[PDB]
Design an enzyme around this catalytic site. Structure first.
Site, PDB file in Angstrom:
ATOM      1  N   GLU A  46      84.089  10.634 -39.767  1.00 49.76           N
ATOM      2  CA  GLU A  46      82.867  10.687 -38.929  1.00 49.76           C
ATOM      3  C   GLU A  46      82.764   9.507 -37.968  1.00 49.76           C
ATOM      4  OE1 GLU A  46      80.282  13.384 -41.968  1.00 49.76           O
ATOM      5  OE2 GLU A  46      79.329  11.602 -41.135  1.00 49.76           O
ATOM      6  N   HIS A  47      83.665   8.545 -38.043  1.00 48.67           N
ATOM      7  CA  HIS A  47      83.628   7.356 -37.162  1.00 48.67           C
ATOM      8  C   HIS A  47      85.002   7.168 -36.557  1.00 48.67           C
ATOM      9  CE1 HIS A  47      79.687   6.157 -38.717  1.00 48.67           C
ATOM     10  NE2 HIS A  47      80.177   6.400 -39.943  1.00 48.67           N
TER      11      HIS A  47
END
Length: 289
Positions: free
Chosen positions: A139-140
Site C-alpha cells: 500500500e506504500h
C-alpha cells in the site's frame, strides 16, 4: 443503448484476520457452510521486527509473519479446516504498517534478489502454516525515485508465477484501493500477470455517487469478472460504513456483479458494538442469491 447483463455472481466470502491483536481466533468467526470461505492472515512482511522498540527496516523480500501467531498457529489453521471443509486460509503480504510502527513500503534492492527472497520466504510460510494461497497488499510506494511500477510488476508477477509453479492449486489475489499511486502500480500488474492472479480484493471501504458505479470503475480497471466487493467493520463513522457496504453488495448481486465479498477485519468486528453481525449478513448475501 442496453448494457450486456452481467453474469458474475459467486459464492466467495473472505475475512482478513490477525493484524490487530484483539485476541480473535478462527473459531470466533461465524462460518456459513453454504459458501466458499477464506481467511487471510494479516500479514507477512519483508521487514525486521519492532519487538522491544526496534525500528523495522526492509529485508529485501525476506517475509516473516507479523499477525497474532499465538492465536492463529499452524495447528489452528488445521483445526478450522478440519471442522469446516469449505474453509481455505491464505497469507496476506504487506499491509499498512509493521504492527502499527513503520509504514510498509515496497522496497526491493532489485527484482531478482527480492523475488528469490520472496519465493523462498513466502513458500516457507505457506508450507509452515499449510496455507492455500497469498494476497498481495502493498500500500506504500517510493514513487519519487524509489522502486517504480515496472519493478513492482516484475517482482509480484514473478513471485506469483513461481508460487503457482511450486503450489499449482493455490489462490492468489491483489488488494488495490482507490489511490492514484496504488492504482498505477496494480493496474499494469493485472494486465501483465492476470494469468497467475486469481482475484482482485479491491478495498471499497471519490465523487462517484453510488457503490455500484464505484465497483464498475474497478471492474473496468481490472477486467475479467474477479473483482470482489468489500467493506470495513469497527469504524469511527459507525454502522453507516458497513450498512452502505451491505446495501452495495445486495445491489451488485441484483445486477449480476457480485463475484464475492470480503471484510476488514475479524479483529475489528470482535471488539465492535455489533460483534460478527456483518460477517453473518455478508455471508447470507453470498450464500443465498
Amino acid at each position: 443503448m442496453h448494457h450486456h447483463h452481467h453474469h458474475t455472481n459467486g459464492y466467495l466470502f473472505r475475512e482478513y484476520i490477525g493484524a490487530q491483536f484483539t485476541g480473535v481466533r478462527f473459531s470466533d468467526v461465524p462460518i456459513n457452510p453454504n459458501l466458499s470461505f477464506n481467511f487471510i492472515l494479516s500479514f507477512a512482511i519483508d521487514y525486521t521486527s519492532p519487538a522491544g522498540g526496534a525500528t523495522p527496516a526492509p529485508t529485501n523480500g525476506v517475509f516473516s509473519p507479523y499477525w497474532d501467531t499465538a492465536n492463529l498457529s499452524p495447528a489452528d489453521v488445521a483445526a478450522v479446516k478440519a471442522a469446516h471443509p469449505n474453509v481455505s486460509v491464505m497469507v496476506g503480504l504487506g499491509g499498512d504498517s509493521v504492527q502499527d510502527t513503520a509504514k510498509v513500503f515496497f522496497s526491493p534492492t532489485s527484482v531478482d534478489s527480492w523475488v528469490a527472497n520472496a519465493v523462498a520466504s513466502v513458500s516457507g510460510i505457506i508450507d509452515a502454516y499449510g496455507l492455500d494461497g497469498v494476497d498481495v497488499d502493498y500500500e506504500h510506494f517510493n514513487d519519487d525515485g524509489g522502486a517504480g511500477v515496472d519493478t513492482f510488476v516484475e517482482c509480484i508477477g514473478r513471485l506469483l508465477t513461481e508460487l503457482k509453479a511450486r503450489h499449482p492449486n493455490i489462490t492468489t489475489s491483489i488488494a488495490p484501493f482507490e489511490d492514484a499511486v496504488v492504482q498505477r502500480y496494480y493496474q499494469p500488474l493485472w494486465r501483465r500477470y492476470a494469468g497467475v492472479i486469481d482475484l482482485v480484493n479491491f478495498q471499497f471501504y471519490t465523487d462517484v455517487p453510488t457503490y455500484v458505479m464505484f465497483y464498475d470503475e474497478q471492474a473496468a480497471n481490472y477486467p475479467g469478472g474477479k473483482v470482489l466487493a468489500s467493506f470495513k467493520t469497527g469504524d469511527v463513522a459507525g454502522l453507516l460504513w458497513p450498512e452502505q457496504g451491505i446495501a452495495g453488495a445486495k445491489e451488485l448481486q441484483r445486477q449480476g456483479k457480485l463475484p464475492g465479498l470480503f471484510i476488514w477485519s475479524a479483529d475489528s468486528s470482535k471488539v465492535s458494538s455489533y460483534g460478527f453481525e456483518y460477517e453473518i449478513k455478508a455471508q447470507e448475501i453470498i450464500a443465498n442469491h
